[PDB]
């Protein structure tokens, strides 16, 4: 084909043209490659030019003689050529035209021929040429879209174009900086996340940014444009490594800033948890329309709902900054602040409660060790308004009989129930504050914090009481007092918040596990918000951890306290990790593994790979033992990001149980406790293997930890999983008891387990998305790793909640009707077809009033187009409240 016998032009061809395409096209193979590359001699390029018209004509005859045998021998080598490698880039006038038919040859091989090899060879040639050619290339794609003969090729035509660009060979800085990408987006949405994700560049996100911002109004409408971008980002994040991940989030934040629909913008600001970024977006959500309508409601509900706080007050990092701005614009003082503060959320909780039904009071017995268990169940089940009101009011019965750290805990747990009330409920908390021993007085402050997270308007503030008490001596008094301060002050960026965090007013006067709470307390102030980069919290961790080599339990808590504070950016976490490394401790290797794992999430690449890494045949301390058996679940990602990833990692996970279990006998005991937590922390779509596994082993071997970890899963949906668990927990409970202490655990789990069908359900969503940063999961993870029989643990134990709203109220526009639109769900599943980002919108219809039953009927697609209202919120991982822009005054409610 490089022959001067004519296959190429050493002189003008016309004879081989007709003849060669039937059997297998020989003419165009040598012509496009060999002639162009050997001679870039311009007199010879003119013969080719004259030849060019002929070249166009070749495509219709070539489509006539299609058949797999005729097509396969003809071209393998055109596919391979690169323009810059024939150096035909360096003459622009005549080679550019030669590219116009050259493309038309390639497209037939790419899709129609189905095997994996033809696509990959074909990618390298399209990309290089496309970027260099640009503007003319856009015209070239259109000509192909139409097709010389209208046959099978057209359907494929859109995908191949964008599929080719993915490769991004040679130039990576492009030639256009808007790319050829733009017309393809509207036609095909599937191909595009494949391109951004493999490319894994910030530059990739730049090209995507420019085109979506213009395309918003012009192409079709705002609503579809908004939808296209949200899907694209979602594939892309998993593939990018963590330092770079922060950069892509901001880039995306700009596309959204302009847009009418805010939902995705908030998720990006949440991931980072930055003070400045969240402020910028909020002011932008409200501004579009000065009337309250979708704009203000969308911004206010969506950003505030998002989690980072175990208490129900959600973020509150945004709350102080955002509120002053919203009252200034003035749509009313009372409306802006009421939605903004937790007050509106207190009502919606109350109404949902009835439908879902209640597991009764958490009381069992007020005598013996059972009185401690009773106390603990009330706190765990309800961090909201109860129906167990009657037991709490009567303080004297439950609260007082309590022993040791359980007294402090009883007093905490009471605040959880009183949360959503403070218009009379406050008074008792204050009686408890004045009187008696330190444990009860400190308990009352922790509890106050909890109640005073039900308002931001504040009445007889908790904040005043606390300040003086932390300072005040007695290790039990300070311990409760600091922990309370973390809720009450909140995620806020007020100077009041910043200044307190600087001195460690917490426990550092004991060499026991109770001292560990000090690092936790500084974490409790931030509550998921990003670091100020304070030195005090990092230094404290070295001190406490170093001195013992005697408590396994102590060493692990200091990195766990740090993780809470650290939670925020990929950028920020590298810096705080540095300070610790300078000194080296074998106890730190436990912390090194924790911080790295928290930092890494947001990436399927770095995270899963770290998550199997084991040496455990040296020590069972913290020394070389490390976090590894615990770590094996792969929870951090599942919580953080993506709907697909959550099931895939669990798929890995099942096999890992065997590996620990068989590997050691000791390994099995520890593995069983942490595996049961994956279910709660991760929110998998699998409920097959693990619930049953735990149940059967616990009949064989008394071991109390198993019931406890399981019941935390059992809160999520309470007669899916709870069906099995309730039976097992009861049977063991009443055929085995080893101690009063042993009994106490088994009851606590047994009661915690039921609380019918998705009431104050646990999900690690935001309920606007689940791609964002969830609540502090590490607090149940802390209670699950170590024995729950340890009396010291009790204070921390009371908050291990990781709840997600029972709200499924429709809003995001001002109309404010209860019980939202019709939607699609499949709840006869354990894996599903669509988990791209948004699932199938057919399935089997659900619009019932009762709260959604996920995590084996997880899929919700929001459907509303038939009713003629449109979603502002498309399913981004949401499991709570709908956001729509309503053109109706009353939002329909359906059965299904």
Partner 1 sequence: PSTFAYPAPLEVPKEKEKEKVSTAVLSITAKAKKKEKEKEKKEEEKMEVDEAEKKEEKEKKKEPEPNFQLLDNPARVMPAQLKVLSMTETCRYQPFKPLSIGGIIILKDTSEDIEELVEPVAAHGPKIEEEEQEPEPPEPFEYIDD
Which positions lie near partner 1, rule CB under 8 A? 172, 198-203, 239-244, 570, 573-574, 577, 581, 592, 595-596, 599-600, 605-606, 609-610, 612-615, 617
Burial of 222 from C-beta contacts in 10 A (0-12 / 13-18 / 19+):
middle
Strands 882-883 and 810-811: parallel
Closer residue to partner 1 (CB): 550 or 575: 575
Shortest distance, position 442 Cβ to partner 1, whole Å: 37
Phi/psi region, residue 298 (left: phi>0; alpha: psi -120 to 50; beta: rest), is alpha
| DSSP code, position 646 | H
Please state, as a whole number, how many other Cβ atoms lie within 10 Å of the Cβ of residue 60: 11
Whether residue 544 contacts residue 507, with contact meaning beta carbons closer than 8 Å, is answered with: no
Shortest distance, position 605 Cβ to partner 1, whole Å: 5
Closer residue to partner 1 (CB): 206 or 388: 206
H helical segments located in 502-569: 517-526, 535-547, 552-566
Closer residue to partner 1 (CB): 613 or 850: 613
Shortest distance, position 197 Cβ to partner 1, whole Å: 9
Whether residue 156 contacts residue 124, with contact meaning beta carbons closer than 8 Å, is answered with: no
Shortest distance, position 892 Cβ to partner 1, whole Å: 47
Question: Rounded CA gap, 58 and 35, in Å?
Answer: 18
Whether residue 481 contacts residue 469, with contact meaning beta carbons closer than 8 Å, is answered with: yes
Shortest distance, position 604 Cβ to partner 1, whole Å: 10
Shortest distance, position 614 Cβ to partner 1, whole Å: 7
Shortest distance, position 617 Cβ to partner 1, whole Å: 6
Question: Rounded CA gap, 164 and 179, in Å?
Answer: 12
Shortest distance, position 459 Cβ to partner 1, whole Å: 45
Closer residue to partner 1 (CB): 242 or 319: 242
Shortest distance, position 659 Cβ to partner 1, whole Å: 12
Whether residue 845 contacts residue 894, with contact meaning beta carbons closer than 8 Å, is answered with: yes
Question: Rounded CA gap, 298 and 813, in Å?
Answer: 7
Whole-Å CA distances, 489 to 97, 462, 468, 492, 645: 68, 9, 14, 7, 35
Residue whose C-alpha is closest to residue 853's, from 654, 664, 720, 760: 720
Whether residue 846 contacts residue 896, with contact meaning beta carbons closer than 8 Å, is answered with: yes
Closer residue to partner 1 (CB): 291 or 617: 617
Whole-Å CA distances, 296 to 259, 266, 330, 555: 14, 13, 11, 47
Closer residue to partner 1 (CB): 54 or 244: 244
3-class SS of residue 849: coil
Shortest distance, position 628 Cβ to partner 1, whole Å: 10
Shortest distance, position 120 Cβ to partner 1, whole Å: 13
Shortest distance, position 613 Cβ to partner 1, whole Å: 6
Closer residue to partner 1 (CB): 279 or 571: 571
Could you write out the three-class secondary structure of 882-893? EECECCCCCCCC
- Provide the CB-side half-sphere exposure for 376 (13 A, CA): 31
Shortest distance, position 228 Cβ to partner 1, whole Å: 23
- Provide the CB-side half-sphere exposure for 23 (13 A, CA): 7
Q: Would you list the DSSP string of 454-490?
A: S-SS-SS-SHHHHHHHHHS--HHHHHHHHHHHHHHH-
Residue whose C-alpha is closest to residue 310's, from 237, 379, 395, 209: 379
Strands 810-811 and 861-862: unpaired
Whether residue 156 contacts residue 114, with contact meaning beta carbons closer than 8 Å, is answered with: no
Question: Rounded CA gap, 163 and 167, in Å?
Answer: 8
Closer residue to partner 1 (CB): 553 or 592: 592
Element (H, E) at 862: strand 861-862
Closer residue to partner 1 (CB): 656 or 820: 656
Closer residue to partner 1 (CB): 605 or 867: 605
**How are strands ordered across the β-sheet holding 823-825?**
844-846, 823-825, 861-862
Strands 823-825 and 844-846: antiparallel
Shortest distance, position 615 Cβ to partner 1, whole Å: 5
Shortest distance, position 784 Cβ to partner 1, whole Å: 25
Residue whose C-alpha is closest to residue 776's, from 803, 805, 749: 803
Dihedrals phi, psi of 306, to nearest 5 degrees: -50, 150
Closer residue to partner 1 (CB): 143 or 614: 614
Question: Rounded CA gap, 542 and 558, in Å?
Answer: 8
Closer residue to partner 1 (CB): 547 or 624: 624
Shortest distance, position 716 Cβ to partner 1, whole Å: 32
Closer residue to partner 1 (CB): 166 or 809: 166
Whole-Å CA distances, 308 to 615, 639, 764, 803, 850: 33, 12, 10, 11, 26
Closer residue to partner 1 (CB): 206 or 279: 206
Question: Rounded CA gap, 768 and 79, in Å?
Answer: 45
3-class SS of residue 145: helix
Shortest distance, position 181 Cβ to partner 1, whole Å: 18
Closer residue to partner 1 (CB): 311 or 572: 572
Closer residue to partner 1 (CB): 283 or 605: 605
Closer residue to partner 1 (CB): 238 or 863: 238
Tell me how many degrees the CA angle 700-706-710 measures, rounded to the nearest 5. 125
Closer residue to partner 1 (CB): 477 or 576: 576
> Which residues, in sequence order, are CB contacts of 47 under 8 Å at separation 6+?
9, 11, 12
Shortest distance, position 612 Cβ to partner 1, whole Å: 6
């Amino acid at each position: 084909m490089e022959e001067g016998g004519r296959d190429k032009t050493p002189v003008q061809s016309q004879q081989p043209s007709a003849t060669a395409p039937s059997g297998a096209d020989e003419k165009s193979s040598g012509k496009e490659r060999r002639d162009a590359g050997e001679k870039d001699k311009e007199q010879e390029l003119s013969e080719e030019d004259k030849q060019l018209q002929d070249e166009l004509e070749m495509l219709v005859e070539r489509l006539g003689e299609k058949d797999t045998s005729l097509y396969r021998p003809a071209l393998e080598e055109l596919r391979r050529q690169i323009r810059s490698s024939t150096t035909s880039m360096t003459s622009v006038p005549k080679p550019l035209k030669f590219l116009r038919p050259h493309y038309g040859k390639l497209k037939e091989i790419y899709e129609n021929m189905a095997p994996g090899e033809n696509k990959c060879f074909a990618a390298d040639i399209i990309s290089v040429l496309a970027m260099t050619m640009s503007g003319e290339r856009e015209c070239l794609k259109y000509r192909l879209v139409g097709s010389q003969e209208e046959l099978a090729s057209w359907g494929h035509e859109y995908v191949r174009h964008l599929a080719g660009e993915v490769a991004k060979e040679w130039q990576e800085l492009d030639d256009a900086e808007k790319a050829q990408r733009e017309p393809l987006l509207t036609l095909v949405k599937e191909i595009v996340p494949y391109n951004m994700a493999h490319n894994a560049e910030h530059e990739a996100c730049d090209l995507l940014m420019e085109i979506e911002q213009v395309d918003m109004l012009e192409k079709d409408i705002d609503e579809n444009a908004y939808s296209k971008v949200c899907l694209y980002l979602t594939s892309c994040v998993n593939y990018v490594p963590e330092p770079e991940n922060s950069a892509l989030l901001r880039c995306a934040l700009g596309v959204f800033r302009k847009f009418s629909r805010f939902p995705e913008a908030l998720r990006l600001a949440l991931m980072l948890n930055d003070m400045e970024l969240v402020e910028d977006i909020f002011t932008s959500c409200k501004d579009v329309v000065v009337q309250k309508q979708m704009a203000f409601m969308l911004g206010r509900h969506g950003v505030f709902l998002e989690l980072s706080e175990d208490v129900e007050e959600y973020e509150d990092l945004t709350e102080i900054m955002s509120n002053v701005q919203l009252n200034s614009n003035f749509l009313a003082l009372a409306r802006e602040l009421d939605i903004m503060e937790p007050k509106v959320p207190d009502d919606i909780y109350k109404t949902h409660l009835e439908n879902n039904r209640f597991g009764g009071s958490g009381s069992q017995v007020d005598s013996a060790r059972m009185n401690l268990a009773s106390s603990f169940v009330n706190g765990f089940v309800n961090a909201a308004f109860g129906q167990d009101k009657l037991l709490t009011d009567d303080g004297n019965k439950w609260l007082y009989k309590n022993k040791d750290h359980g007294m402090l805990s009883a007093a905490a747990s009471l605040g959880m129930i009183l949360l959503w009330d403070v218009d009379g409920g406050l008074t008792q908390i204050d009686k408890y504050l004045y009187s008696s021993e330190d444990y009860i007085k400190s308990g009352a402050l922790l509890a106050c914090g909890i109640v005073n997270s039900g308002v931001r308007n504040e009445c007889d503030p908790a904040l005043a009481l606390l300040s003086d008490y932390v300072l005040h001596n007695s290790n039990t008094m300070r311990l409760g007092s600091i922990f309370g301060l973390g809720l009450a002050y909140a995620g806020s960026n007020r100077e009041d918040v910043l200044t307190l965090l600087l001195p460690v007013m917490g426990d550092s006067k004991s060499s026991m596990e109770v001292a560990g709470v000090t690092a936790l307390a500084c974490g409790m102030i931030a509550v998921g918000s990003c670091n100020g980069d304070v030195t005090s919290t990092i230094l404290q961790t070295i001190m406490e951890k170093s001195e013992t080599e005697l408590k396994d339990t102590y060493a692990r808590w200091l990195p766990l306290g740090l993780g809470l504070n650290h939670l925020g950016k990929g950028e920020a976490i590298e810096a705080i990790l540095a300070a610790l490394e300078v000194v080296s401790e074998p106890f730190r290797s436990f912390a090194n593994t924790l911080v790295d794992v928290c930092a890494y999430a947001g990436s399927g690449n770095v995270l899963k790979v770290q998550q199997l890494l084991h040496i455990c045949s040296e020590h069972f301390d913290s020394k070389e033992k490390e976090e590894d058996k615990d770590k094996k679940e792969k929870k951090d990602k599942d919580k953080k990001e993506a709907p697909a990833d959550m099931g895939a990692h669990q798929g890995v996970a099942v096999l890992g149980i065997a590996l620990i279990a068989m590997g050691e006998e000791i390994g099995a005991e520890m593995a069983l406790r942490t595996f049961g937590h994956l279910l709660r922390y991760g929110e998998p779509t699998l409920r097959r293997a693990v619930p049953l596994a735990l149940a059967l082993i616990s009949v064989s071997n008394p071991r109390l930890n198993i019931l406890d970890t399981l019941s935390k899963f059992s809160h999520d949906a309470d007669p899916e999983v709870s069906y099995n668990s309730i039976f097992a927990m009861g049977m063991v409970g009443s055929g085995t008891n080893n101690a009063r202490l042993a009994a106490m655990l088994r009851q606590l789990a047994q009661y915690h387990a039921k609380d019918p069908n998705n009431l104050f359900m646990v999900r690690l969503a935001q309920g606007l998305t689940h791609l964002g940063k969830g609540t502090l999961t590490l607090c149940p993870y802390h209670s699950d790793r170590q024995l729950m029989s340890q009396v010291a643990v009790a204070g921390l134990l009371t908050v291990l909640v990781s709840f997600l709203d029972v709200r499924n109220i429709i809003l995001g526009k001002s109309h404010y009707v209860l019980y939202g639109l019709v939607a699609a769900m499949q709840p006869r599943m354990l894996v599903t077809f669509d988990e791209e980002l948004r699932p199938l919108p057919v399935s089997v219809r659900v619009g019932q009033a009762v709260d959604v039953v996920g995590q084996a009927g997880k899929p919700k697609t929001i459907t509303g187009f038939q009713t003629h209202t449109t979603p502002v919120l498309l399913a981004h991982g949401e499991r709570a409240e709908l956001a729509t822009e309503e053109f109706l005054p009353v939002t329909p409610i359906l059965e299904g």
